[PDB]
């Protein structure tokens, strides 16, 4: 990231520290939890609202020393009153602005926010699981401020979980108890805490909604798939992701040795010895080298991250993913809860900075072989059948005689988001009780209000609604500002937090109290639908057939002779 954006970020971090101070009040309060009492504090917003803030609530033991790479354990309870008036650190990660490693292994915390701690009626509880590819992110209020949602009468909870290799190392040797998915296990433990504690903050333990964006969406979906979380919540919202996205799951058992060797390991590729080295290394050295683990062949085949959610090679006590996500959809308790799913109208605009650095990537579209789903393609991607499947994609996205950056970015929208969404919907319809799924398409474009991921994707000055652009209308961040109440941005804040709150409340995202919704008739997707209907959210709200449907069916046609793998 540029020196320019680093300095502007530094000035915003100073500005955020003073504004956070200024918006703090003297009104501390104490709530009960099953682990002891916690002290929160009331905070203010730039819209002149206020909320109670409890940050740094532990949901598991700090996963340090011998607990590194292992399933979380319950935290140790305390006497007295634990201070939750300040945030804890984020999980160890490469800071996307500075390029330096930050965070701490002591990161297994959640934060709880509500405008009223003794409501007269129990409130819907919304749980947000942040994205960032399973390698970045946090629940800090400089990125995920509850300021907008606390205008509504809900309880909002923002969790952390282990990222990168510290969260997703996986080793075959059953002796070593590192099966994988430690970070998803973290999220399971956080959900258990929320179920058994939200009542203490005015929440209804029988009305809990989990939601997340990008890796957060894939995480929410894993939470709906695994038997570990059965009945822990009642609605789910998948924003720009799910667990069968090609970036959401990887078999990374081999990659631990490689990480070890980048970090100075001397010895053989054996799991016992590799783990012993990885357990002793400095956490910031491992995370810094993570970016070099993937081979050229892996990157070619579009493996995006070296460590992430994986199929666990053996089943232990806390096993989360015992089989491939496709298989897990077959018996998933969460197929039977009300669900909402959606994407933005130009998701692949997110790859703008990846294309800037590597213009040769656009030439992949001359055959598109690299974008054929890896389960259908041959290892070298030279099989004539791979070239034929690639041709199908190529026809979906290449508009001229030569491919463009735009065709590339549009192709990415489908490969990474819409096609997996299609696959999931059709799989799920073969195994559901008939609970509704509702689709939205986020199509509201502004540059008057932004979030930090626009800096990451070099998105300044770029027209269209990229992956992550909706987060600006859900959460406060340190680049935000108070918007006039009649502004298109402020209305979109109200609509998005209103629709999410309505859904969280009733399992149906429609209300006539949301301005812009007066003509909306928003039906769920049925198994017999050939074309998907969505709520298109722009300056207007309008029910439309998904514009992406034609390109989606063209992707589906790659499976004409491999229907069992669809």
Secondary structure, 3-state, 244-295:
CCCCCCCCCCCHHHHHHHHCCCCCCCCHHHHHHHHHHCCHHHHHHHHHHCCC
- The enclosing H or E element of 20 equals helix 3-22
Angle at 25 between CA 24 and CA 27, to 5 degrees: 135
- The enclosing H or E element of 37 equals strand 37-44
Domain that includes residue 88, residue range? 1-566
DSSP-H helix ranges across 25-78: none
**HSE value, Cβ hemisphere, 13 Å, CA-based, for 314:** 11
Query: What burial class does residue 297 get, using C-beta atoms within 10 Å of its C-beta: 0-12 exposed, 13-18 middle, 19+ buried?
Result: exposed
Task: Tell me the C-alpha distance between 262 and 95, whole Å.
Answer: 20
The tokens describing 38, both together, are: 């916690």
- Owner of token pair 């932004």: 450
Task: Tell me the C-alpha distance between 556 and 495, whole Å.
Answer: 33
Task: Tell me the C-alpha distance between 509 and 501, whole Å.
Answer: 8
DSSP state at residue 339: E
What residues contact 552, with CB distance under 8 A and at least 6 apart?
Answer: 414, 418, 419, 422, 546
C-alpha torsion 62→258→168→316, nearest 10: -90
**HSE value, Cβ hemisphere, 13 Å, CA-based, for 169:** 27
- The enclosing H or E element of 425 equals helix 419-429
What does DSSP say about strands 109-114 and 155-159: parallel, antiparallel, or unpaired? antiparallel
DSSP 63-104: --GGGTTSPP-PPPP-SSEEE-SS--PPPSEE-TTT-SEE--
The tokens describing 43, both together, are: 């905070």
DSSP state at residue 370: G
The tokens describing 556, both together, are: 């589906």
Task: Tell me the C-alpha distance between 94 and 553, whole Å.
Answer: 38
Considering just the CA atoms, what is the radius of gyration of the chain in Å?
A: 23
For CA atoms 51, 96, 442, 448, give the dihedral sign: positive
Report resolution (Å) to 1 decimal.
Answer: 1.7
Helix, strand or coil, per DSSP, at residue 108? coil
Contact 20, 39 (CB under 8 A): no
Query: How many other C-beta atoms lie within 10 A of the C-beta of residue 282?
Result: 11
Contact 306, 169 (CB under 8 A): no
Task: Tell me the C-alpha distance between 398 and 402, whole Å.
Answer: 7
Which technique was the structure solved with, according to the deposited record? Answer: X-ray
**HSE value, Cβ hemisphere, 13 Å, CA-based, for 159:** 31
Q: Which residues, listed in sequence order, are joined to residue 340 by a DSSP beta bridge?
A: 237, 438
Q: Which residues, listed in sequence order, are joined to residue 545 by a DSSP beta bridge?
A: 533
Task: Tell me the C-alpha distance between 355 and 33, whole Å.
Answer: 48
Catalytic center residues: 214, 347, 467
Name the domain count of the chain.
1
| Ramachandran angles phi, psi of 450, nearest 5° | -140, 170
CATH of the domain at 313: 3.40.50.1820
Task: Tell me the C-alpha distance between 146 and 503, whole Å.
Answer: 18
The tokens describing 190, both together, are: 């956080």
Task: Tell me the C-alpha distance between 412 and 393, whole Å.
Answer: 11
- Give how far Cα 419 sits from Cα of 393, 536, 546, Å: 11, 18, 12
**HSE value, Cβ hemisphere, 13 Å, CA-based, for 407:** 22
Task: Tell me the C-alpha distance between 103 and 321, whole Å.
Answer: 27
DSSP state at residue 476: B
DSSP-H helix ranges across 430-537: 453-456, 488-506
- The enclosing H or E element of 222 equals helix 215-225
Contact 346, 413 (CB under 8 A): yes
The tokens describing 210, both together, are: 């989990």
**How do the residues of the chain divide into helix, strand and coil, expressed in percent and rounded to 5?**
35, 15, 45
User: What's the longest Cα–Cα distance across the chain?
Assistant: 71
Task: Tell me the C-alpha distance between 397 and 387, whole Å.
Answer: 15
Query: How many other C-beta atoms lie within 10 A of the C-beta of residue 487?
Result: 13
């Amino acid at each position: 990231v540029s020196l320019m954006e680093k300095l502007k970020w530094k000035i915003k971090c100073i500005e955020n520290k003073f504004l956070n101070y200024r918006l703090t009040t003297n009104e501390t309060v104490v709530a009960e939890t099953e682990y002891g009492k916690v002290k929160g504090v009331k905070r203010l917003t730039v819209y002149d609202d206020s909320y109670y803030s409890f940050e740094g609530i532990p949901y598991a033991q700090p996963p340090v020393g011998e607990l590194r790479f292992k399933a979380p354990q319950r935290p140790t309870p305390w006497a007295g009153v634990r201070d939750c008036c300040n945030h804890k650190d984020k999980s160890v990660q490469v800071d996307f602005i500075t390029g330096k490693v930050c965070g701490s292994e002591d990161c297994l915390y959640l934060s709880v926010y509500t405008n009223n701690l003794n409501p007269e009626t129990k409130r819907p509880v919304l749980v947000y699981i942040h994205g960032g590819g399973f390698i970045i992110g946090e629940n800090h209020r400089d990125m995920y401020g509850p300021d907008y949602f606390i205008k509504k009468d809900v309880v909002l909870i923002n969790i952390q979980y282990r990222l990168g290799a510290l969260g997703f190392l996986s080793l075959n040797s059953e002796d070593l108890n590192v099966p994988g998915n430690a970070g998803l296990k973290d999220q399971v433990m956080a959900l258990r805490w929320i179920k058994n504690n939200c009542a203490n903050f005015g929440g209804n333990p029988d009305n809990i909604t989990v939601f997340g964006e990008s890796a957060g969406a894939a995480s929410t979906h894993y939470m709906m798939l695994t038997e570990q979380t059965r009945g822990l919540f009642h609605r789910g919202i998948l924003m720009s992701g799910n667990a069968i996205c090609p970036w959401a799951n990887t078999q990374c058992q081999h990659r631990a040795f490689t990480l070890a060797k980048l970090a100075g390991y001397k010895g053989e590729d054996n799991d016992k010895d590799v783990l012993e080295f990885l357990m002793k290394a400095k956490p910031q050295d491992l995370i810094k080298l993570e970016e070099k683990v993937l081979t050229l062949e892996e990157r070619t085949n579009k493996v995006m991250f070296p460590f992430g959610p994986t199929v666990e090679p053996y089943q232990t006590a806390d096993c989360v993913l015992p089989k491939h996500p496709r298989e897990m959809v077959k018996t998933a308790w969460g197929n039977s809860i009300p669900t909402m799913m959606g994407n933005t109208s130009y998701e692949g605009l997110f790859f703008t900075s990846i294309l800037k650095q590597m213009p040769l990537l656009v030439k992949e579209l001359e055959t598109c072989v690299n974008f054929v789903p890896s389960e259908l393609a041959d290892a070298e991607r030279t099989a004539p059948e791979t070239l034929e499947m690639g041709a199908k994609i190529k026809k979906a996205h290449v508009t001229g005689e030569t491919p463009t950056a735009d065709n590339f970015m549009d192709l990415c929208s489908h490969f990474y988001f819409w096609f997996p969404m299609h696959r999931l919907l059709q799989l799920r319809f073969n195994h559901t009780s008939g609970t509704p799924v509702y689709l939205y398409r986020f199509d509201f474009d502004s540059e008057d209000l932004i979030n930090p991921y626009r800096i990451m994707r070099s998105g300044r000055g770029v027209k269209g609604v990229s992956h992550t652009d909706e987060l600006t209308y859900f959460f406060w961040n340190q680049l935000a500002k108070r918007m006039p109440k009649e502004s298109r941005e402020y209305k979109t804040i109200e609509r998005m937090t209103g629709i999410w709150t309505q859904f969280a409340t009733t399992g149906n995202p429609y209300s006539n109290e949301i301005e812009g919704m007066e003509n909306v008739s928003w039906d769920p997707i049925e198994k017999s639908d050939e074309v998907y209907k969505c709520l298109n959210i722009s300056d207007e709200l309008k029910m439309i057939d998904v514009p992406e449907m034609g390109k989606i069916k063209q992707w589906e046609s790659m499976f004409e002779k491999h229907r069992d793998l669809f």
